[PDB]
Chain A
């Protein structure tokens, strides 16, 4: 019975979910790339995107400062969000976080693994999929159709 549900049940309670999400968000900000279970990663992706908006809002915002302090346990990160993450994403209007599927852990539980990272980071690029080139026979056939049209 999970019809119309918009929230995952994680941790030992709603407070634990926030704390677990809080810990995940703090770790992601520090490292900018974290590997976690797909279900948890999907839940926290929305939170990370909204956090960047709070950084964009401005340092002087009292709500952002309170929000940043609560979500980020490590206080050294608070300057980073306003001075590193927020400046980086000023051009971007969204999609700050990139989440991709990772092979399942071979730890006898076979948990679904995914990696969530902040776009524009200095970390090495992830092995992203590359779409087929237009030089392919099917694409070339479509190219001929395009020229005729």
Chain B
């Protein structure tokens, strides 16, 4: 599958945490139905937990649009341009709350196999080994077998 699947290296969006941490998620859209068994858990979530999340994270734009809808859906947009959609069809309040928290923590970075879990811009401090390292010199820089 790895041969048939893509991979990447460790990277950061714009060195987010160097100066101050910025939340990647920027906009949340919620679709609900007044009368739908699938939206029952979402219906209760709006009553109780939606306000708490908004107060906890006031920097994410939240859109709640109750409308006649077959399947409730949640759309999350990230600063880097990543957009993710999650179906809320017949999911409980607790499931919804956990999912939103996971979405906020997650970044727009692609989720694929990472070849190296470590990223460094200055891997060497004392200099990278080269063949001439540890090779003893000779007087006058005489090459081997040189009669001179």
Direct A–B contact present (CB less than 8 angstroms): no
Binding site for B on A (CB under 8 A): none
Binding site for A on B (CB under 8 A): none
